[PDB]
Design a binder for these strands. Structure first.
Ligand SMILES: [Zn+2]
Ligand SMILES: [Zn+2]
Ligand SMILES: [Zn+2]
Lengths: 67, 49, 436, 49, 116, 269, 48, 46, 49, 245
RNA sequence: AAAAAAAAAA
């Protein structure tokens, strides 16, 4: 539901490169140019961002149990 | 080979021979390696024609 | 149909326009249906038919829900497609978005659900993009120490320690009081040794004053989790009044023996009978280990033979340690070329940065086209890579095929299937061991 | 009149837009809800009449 | 539930000797050294430093099981040189070689940082 | 029968990556150096997690696993800190563990992105890697969110936690891995035929190659031995890559000296 | 369905009631248990 | 002791002795949840 | 078998005995199947189960 | 139904010999072997009942001559821990224990063997790959059973009849039922090729995985300029005795 | 605690 901290195959830190990936994707970039701008030159780190889903945004829409 | 090594040597020697094959072969396979791929499924274009 | 996304040109307008008709299976004997308009544009000298009445919108909709999830199902075997449809319902993932408030007896939630990089256009409408089940993982196809034989797989320990297929199993228990006017009375409170008869040997200190545990308390073994004490029947014997040392009996609900975890959610309400009704959800951590059942999207089921750390297994020239290794000998017998096409398209889409299309019966996707596009990205055109030994560092003599695929974990864990018994209960009739 | 004829890649895009509109309107569980509405509205009135 | 602890791959237990020496009886001047709680790294170093010695005729490591962190080395030499002395000279030469590696790497980092 | 005399040639050096060539050394040296850089190189990572408020949409163990993988700057700290088993302490001495705290309560209508910057440290030097990112005031990249996102919170959710970070290496757990992929390569022209190309024309050339355009494989040399190796060590942000090399060599000193000490102890029998 | 309380509700209205917007429904709730009715094959009646 | 729960839709701290019926005192809602405990339990970050 | 009236599928012609409507597959699994011969492979693969 | 039995999912283990089975630690702690008390091993059974069920290896019960059972779980009295000659101690399953290994459905005689227990940490059954042909196992979620003999004359019957190497040849078609399969057979095919020229270091690596070797290395096929062996020369060391074929 | 039904794995 959230981005992982590290690349599984690789160990590269990917937790800081998801909201920047979204911000690059929304303006005018494609996915490949956004991955190239983030420094993820290996496709092992690129597959962590190409197929990532953010299900915690749907989880945060629900009302919390404690006010 | 397995049948005649059972019949000529005995049960225990053949059973040890079974285990003596596989460890050496699997350790040699680390040096050699074996792999199938999508390139093995594609033949010559002349053969395809 | 490009402005029904704007306002109003719905599908019923398209049906009412006279271009789409509901043809049933009885009317199929009297109509003529084609694959494509390319069949319509054929010249009459070599035309297969000249009187066409209908045309298929897309043939790939002849599949169902769990059979359309296979990337390139036309390159695979039909019994293996049936196997993938059978174990497609046994995949692990986020089953629903409001699972935090739902109360299911058995549930599983993956940490990081992954949408498939190699996907069709059919899972856009099954909401598998929004609710996925499975993980894209780097796999190679080679033989490493013989532990992957007979459909077996070997995971990477460093990836699993980073969070590869680690999941949470939710288990729900429930209990209820009964205050019927003719019945024994039971109440929810913390049991006491001097007041309850036949108390089982458990740790009763974890319960609260109402006999119901608080969430966040770690439970393990045979810890008591719901405290219910039932009033004993009025067997007031006048021959000996000192024999009634207990007025209540323990009717508590206990944790399952071979499960440990943390109490996630605690629920009290009123049932249809108006009595108190408790429902508790306890979460447990399911780390992948040896023997856990994994499967592909092409019917390549198997179990984890062994785990290997990153320093003790194969690595490429780019230092890429794959997440998972499989047996090549499982490939030709199962007849899964679509798995190889999925791997090649996954490597191409991960190097390029695009979501791959795996729609069946599509002439725009070819093996040679994917090979030609993959050749431009500095890799081998058949997707082969040169790796090294993990223990020694020597180059592998045979080049190996590597790339990302989509693998799905299965619910047949070894923790839910291990059983051992020395001596235990016997039946009241035949004095034989139990069942289950 | 030939401008209304759909080309090949336009045919694949148009047919997937048709599939998108069909799944946007009808959905996946349309027959269950439709049979439930048939049972609730017309069938119960037919039983009591 | 049967998961072994993750610190057992490098930590000896109570009363567990690290190096166990067994005298081979098939040939002469041969020994087997068993080292626990390690992996292919140290055995590969010991072996590929021993193989440069012409005085040795047999030097070989083997891990019997990936789940058991333990490996054995069989060493047989000629009849003028102990296998234990051969292994001692091997680890001494390894220490000298990677000390040279450490100082050449330190000099390389110093010249690369000062050169800009 | 004596030791080798190897040589160094560093080609590229930056903050998180180093590229170098080793000359005149064995293949086991390079393979075990890669092994000790990945596995047995120690660093500091969060190990002991205590939660006092977890009213978010995530579980306790998922948040603990997410904060355990966060790299920490431990270049000058890991060589002095001892292990927990090697201390006479019991209640987490400052020479044994590093204390971190976090307490974020969201009271705004927008989403609060709790990142590593909210993880305060008792030690003045043991910090996350985002201290290198907060000093970039020339941010023409367009986005200032260069920090590792720990969790997102809505209004009414709070998170309070106390953590102790200990010393460990990647063989024990992958959260103590200091590198982010070590590239190792020998003989890029296949002069030794250690690997067998059925079609050498279909394979792209390596970056360390020495052949021209129309030549695809070097001529076979049976007398050739592995003595030239290319290494590209990329850091994950926890440690500097030359410091990763230095502590890997020091771990190799400790292991070989321990083997020598054990041999000298068992020799008197 | 048409007569249920979740008829033609938005995603925000379903989320405020702690319901999944992606949930298609199609099931009954009997004593808190989700029950699904399987369609049964049969012969076509009034057919020769 | 007379301890507390959270109402399903009020999200309100309702306190009672554990013999009262399960009912919110502000809106009358049969659904209540138990508060997370104050006991601190150690979690490993592996 | 002719499941329909002298047709295996409605996409063919009545009284057709050619290998496209018969069930012969002229393409490999690497090249991909047409939907009719994929359905015929489903016919073949159901019988083994 | 039987009492002393277990069942779990099987996983491959190539380095194990065929007459061995890998047993999980919790199964070996739960299942007990009822060993008699002898003067030959009085001290070992004494230290086993002193360790008890809390530590592995240990014991769970002492059954004495008159049928009285003494437990270890509920803090046993030290006066009850007396081991006279001829008593019964239900010890834990240690190494080299003969057990029955059976996969269901059992279609023939060869689908249940006798095996020697080797204790491995993980919670699956571990055995040799050549067991896959008589058991018809596929390692795709196969649940499979193990049984422990509770009398040592039955253990002698397991050793003399039910063991795997005594059941190599089927009487059904006078053929072996286990064989070299999968990538082991593929590398046997790829290793006996004439062009496979293998160095001193690689055959040196392959040497220690032959425990029946007589520590007499062969003279190489190639002596100058580089000492090289071949695949048939090193498969020759694997084959014992006088074999002509 | 029994029995019945359903869902599955081999
Ligand atoms: Zn990576
Ligand atoms: Zn300390
Ligand atoms: Zn309320």
């Amino acid at each position: 539901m959230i981005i992982p901290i590290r690349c599984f195959t690789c160990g590269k830190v990917i937790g800081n490169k998801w909201e920047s990936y979204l911000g690059l994707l929304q303006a005018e970039y494609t996915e490949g140019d956004a991955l190239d701008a983030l420094g993820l030159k290996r496709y092992c780190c690129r597959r962590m961002l190409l197929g990532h889903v953010d299900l915690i945004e749907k989880l945060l829409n629900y009302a919390p149990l404690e006010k | 080979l397995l049948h005649i090594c059972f019949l000529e040597l005995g049960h225990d020697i053949a059973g040890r021979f079974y285990g003596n094959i596989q460890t050496v072969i699997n350790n040699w396979l680390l040096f050699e390696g074996h792999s199938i791929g999508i390139g093995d499924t594609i033949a010559d274009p002349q053969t395809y024609n | 149909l490009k402005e029904r996304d704007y306002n109003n040109y719905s599908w019923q307008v398209l049906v009412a326009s006279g271009v789409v008709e509901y043809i049933d299976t009885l009317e199929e004997e009297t109509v003529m249906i084609a694959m494509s308009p390319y069949d319509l544009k054929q010249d009459k000298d070599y035309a297969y038919c000249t009187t066409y009445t209908h045309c298929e919108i897309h043939p790939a909709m002849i599949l169902g829900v769990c059979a359309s999830i296979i990337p390139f199902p036309d390159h695979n075997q039909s019994p293996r497609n049936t196997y993938q449809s059978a174990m497609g319902k046994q995949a692990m993932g986020v089953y629903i978005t409001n699972f935090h408030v739902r109360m299911d007896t058995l549930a599983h939630v993956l940490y990081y659900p992954m949408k498939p990089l190699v996907t069709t256009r059919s899972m856009e409408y099954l909401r598998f993009r929004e609710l996925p089940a499975g993980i894209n993982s780097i796999v190679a196809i080679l033989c490493y120490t013989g532990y992957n034989q007979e459909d077996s797989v070997i995971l990477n320990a460093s990836a699993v320690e980073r969070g590869f297929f680690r999941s949470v199993f939710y288990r729900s228990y429930k209990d209820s009081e009964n205050k019927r006017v003719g019945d024994q009375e039971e109440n929810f409170e913390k049991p006491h040794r001097g007041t309850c008869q036949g108390m089982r040997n458990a740790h009763y200190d974890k319960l609260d004053d109402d006999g119901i545990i608080a969430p966040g308390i770690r439970v393990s073994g045979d810890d008591v989790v719901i405290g219910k004490t039932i009033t004993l029947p009025e067997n007031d014997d006048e021959l000996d009044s000192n024999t009634k040392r207990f007025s209540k009996r323990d009717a508590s609900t206990f944790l399952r023996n071979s499960e440990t975890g943390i109490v996630d959610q605690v629920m009290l309400t009123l049932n249809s009978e108006g009595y108190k009704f408790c429902k508790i959800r306890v979460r447990s951590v399911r780390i992948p280990q040896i023997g856990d059942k994994f499967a592909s999207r092409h019917g390549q089921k198997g179990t984890c033979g062994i785990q290997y750390r990153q320093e003790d297994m194969a690595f490429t020239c780019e230092g890429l340690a794959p997440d998972i290794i499989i047996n090549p000998h499982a490939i030709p017998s199962r007849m899964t070329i679509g798995h190889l096409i999925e791997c090649l398209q996954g490597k191409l889409g991960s190097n390029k940065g695009e979501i791959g299309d795996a729609t069946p019966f599509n002439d725009a996707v070819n093996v040679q086209k994917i090979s030609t596009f993959l050749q431009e990205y500095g890799y081998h055109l058949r997707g082969n890579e040169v790796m090294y030994n993990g223990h020694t560092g020597r180059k592998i003599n045979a080049q190996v095929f590597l790339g990302p695929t989509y693998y799905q974990r299965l619910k047949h864990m070894v923790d839910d299937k291990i059983h051992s018994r020395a001596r235990g209960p016997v039946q009241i009739l035949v004095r034989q061991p139990m069942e289950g | 009149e030939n401008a209304e004829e759909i080309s090949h890649e336009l045919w694949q895009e148009a047919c997937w837009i048709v599939i998108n509109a069909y799944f946007d309107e009808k959905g996946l569980v349309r027959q269950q809800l439709d049979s439930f509405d048939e049972f609730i509205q017309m069938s119960v009135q037919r039983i009591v009449e | 539930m049967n998961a072994p602890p993750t610190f057992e791959s490098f930590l000896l237990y109570e009363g567990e000797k690290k190096i166990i020496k067994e005298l081979d009886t098939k040939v002469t001047n041969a020994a087997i050294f068993t080292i626990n709680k390690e992996d292919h790294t140290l055995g590969n170093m010991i072996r590929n430093q021993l193989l440069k010695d012409p005085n040795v005729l047999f030097a070989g490591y083997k891990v019997p099981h990936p789940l058991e962190h333990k490996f054995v080395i069989r060493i047989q030499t000629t009849a003028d040189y102990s296998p234990q002395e051969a292994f001692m000279n091997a680890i001494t030469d390894l220490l000298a070689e990677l000390s040279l590696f450490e100082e050449r790497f330190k000099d390389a980092i110093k010249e690369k940082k000062e050169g800009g | 029968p004596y030791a080798n005399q190897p040589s160094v040639q560093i080609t590229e050096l930056t903050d998180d990556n180093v590229k170098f060539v080793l000359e005149d050394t064995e293949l086991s040296v390079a393979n075990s150096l890669r092994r000790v850089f990945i596995a047995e190189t120690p660093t500091l990572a969060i190990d002991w997690v205590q939660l006092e408020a977890n009213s978010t949409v995530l579980s306790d163990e998922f948040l603990a696993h997410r904060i355990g993988l966060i790299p920490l700057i431990s270049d000058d700290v890991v060589e002095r800190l001892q292990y927990t088993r090697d201390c006479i302490c019991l209640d987490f001495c400052p020479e044994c563990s590093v204390e971190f705290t976090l307490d974020v309560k969201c009271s705004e209508e927008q989403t609060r992105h709790v990142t590593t910057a909210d993880l305060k440290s008792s030690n003045a030097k043991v910090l996350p890697v985002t201290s290198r990112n907060q000093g970039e005031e020339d941010n023409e990249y367009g986005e200032s969110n260069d920090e590792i996102l720990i969790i997102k919170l809505r209004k009414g959710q709070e998170l309070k936690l106390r953590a102790y970070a200990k010393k460990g290496f990647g063989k024990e757990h992958a959260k103590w891995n200091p590198t982010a992929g070590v590239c190792f390569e020998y003989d890029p022209d296949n002069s030794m035929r250690h690997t067998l190309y059925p079609k050498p024309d279909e394979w792209p050339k390596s970056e360390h190659t020495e052949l021209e355009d129309d030549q695809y494989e070097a001529p076979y040399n049976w007398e050739a031995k592995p003595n030239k190796f290319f290494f590209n060590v990329e850091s994950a942000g926890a440690l500097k890559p030359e410091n990763i090399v230095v502590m890997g060599v020091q771990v190799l000193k400790n292991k070989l000296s321990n083997l020598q000490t054990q041999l000298s102890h068992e020799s008197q029998n | 369905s048409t007569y249920c309380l979740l008829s033609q509700l938005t995603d925000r209205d379903l989320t405020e009631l702690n319901e999944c917007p992606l949930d298609p429904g199609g099931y009954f709730i009997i004593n808190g248990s989700e029950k699904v009715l399987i369609a049964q094959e049969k012969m076509a009646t009034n057919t020769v | 002791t007379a301890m507390t729960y959270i109402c399903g839709e009020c999200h309100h701290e309702n306190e009672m002795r554990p013999r009262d019926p399960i009912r919110c005192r502000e809106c009358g809602y049969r659904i209540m949840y138990k508060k997370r405990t104050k006991r601190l339990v150690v979690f490993d970050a592996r | 078998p002719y499941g329909f009236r002298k047709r295996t599928l409605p996409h063919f012609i009545k009284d057709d005995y050619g290998p496209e409507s018969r069930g012969f597959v002229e393409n490999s699994y690497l090249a991909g199947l047409t939907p009719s011969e994929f359905y015929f492979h489903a016919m073949g693969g159901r019988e083994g189960l | 139904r039987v009492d002393f039995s277990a069942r779990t999912v099987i996983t491959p283990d190539p380095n194990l010999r065929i007459d061995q089975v890998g047993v999980p630690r919790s199964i070996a702690q739960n299942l007990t072997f009822p060993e008699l008390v002898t003067p030959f091993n009085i001290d070992r059974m004494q230290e086993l009942v002193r360790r008890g069920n809390s530590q592995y290896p240990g014991a769970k019960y002492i059954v004495r001559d008159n049928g009285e059972r003494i437990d270890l779980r509920f803090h046993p009295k030290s006066s009850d821990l007396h081991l006279q000659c001829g008593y019964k101690v239900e010890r834990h399953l240690r190494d080299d224990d003969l057990v029955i290994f059976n996969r269901q459905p059992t279609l023939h005689k060869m689908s249940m063997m006798g095996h020697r227990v080797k204790v491995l940490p993980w919670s699956t059954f571990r055995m040799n790959l050549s067991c896959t042909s008589p058991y018809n196992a596929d390692f795709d979620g196969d649940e499979m059973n193990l049984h422990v003999p509770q009398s040592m004359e039955t253990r002698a019957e397991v050793e003399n009849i039910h063991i795997t190497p005594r059941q190599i040849i089927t009487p059904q078609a006078n053929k072996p039922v286990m064989g070299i399969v999968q990538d082991t057979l593929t590398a046997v095919r790829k290793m006996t090729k004439r062009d496979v020229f293998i160095t001193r270091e690689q055959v040196m690596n392959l040497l220690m995985f032959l425990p029946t070797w007589d520590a007499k290395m062969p003279q190489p096929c190639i002596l100058k300029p580089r000492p090289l062996w071949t695949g048939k020369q090193i498969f020759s060391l694997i084959i014992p005795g006088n074999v002509n074929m």
